[PDB]
Amino acid sequence: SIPHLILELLKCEPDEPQVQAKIMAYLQQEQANRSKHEKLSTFGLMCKMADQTLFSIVEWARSSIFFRELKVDDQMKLLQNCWSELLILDHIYRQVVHGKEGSIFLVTGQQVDYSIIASQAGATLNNLMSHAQELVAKLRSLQFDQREFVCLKFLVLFSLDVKNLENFQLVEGVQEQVNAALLDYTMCNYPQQTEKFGQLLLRLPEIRAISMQAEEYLYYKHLNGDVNLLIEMLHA
């Protein structure tokens, strides 16, 4: 069975084909615009891809249960704290579902060879991507499913590490009830893996660590002149 709370979370999930189709189409018109001598760098197009994913993440949150009851200033504080975590969690789950050995699946629906990306990404990004791939492998070995994914999405969004909230009690309550629903769901649907609940929860600090290091690297690249909504989220 599925706890009713998780069913409510599953309702709020975006239409993933249309989300991916819209981002794919955006990137195509941007390239189709540019002339021979003003191609985008590989890093630049990944930033635009992340930028467009962020737009869809904000629209997802704004219409989600619980989040839509917060005042907008509370909503901004929550998203400013977790936007990079949500991007990384979305990337990781995409590899869990669709990933094949030696390739990366993008939000556009494209599959790209790891050797191509690793040639261009540089040492820092390659390290962070390898750390993320280690999480993909663990989550795949645990049979990470969509119900657990949406739980982790809300646990990331409703972070106890956000201050100066008007309604911190709601964030505290959502964190507690989603935790309790995930504990119940894993026990009922995967009764033989005692470790699953704890292994899922321990990926959250790891995703947080990858996410914050990714933010710091992106800030460096911006200050270096190598990089929209993405920049706005970095500054705030």
Binding site: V58, E59, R62, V72, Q75, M76, L79, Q80, L229, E232
Partner: peptide, 12 residues
């Protein structure tokens, strides 16, 4: 972050 506020407030 005027852009984030706008994305959360806009009607379309």
């Amino acid at each position: 972050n005027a852009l984030l506020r706008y994305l959360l407030d806009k009607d379309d």
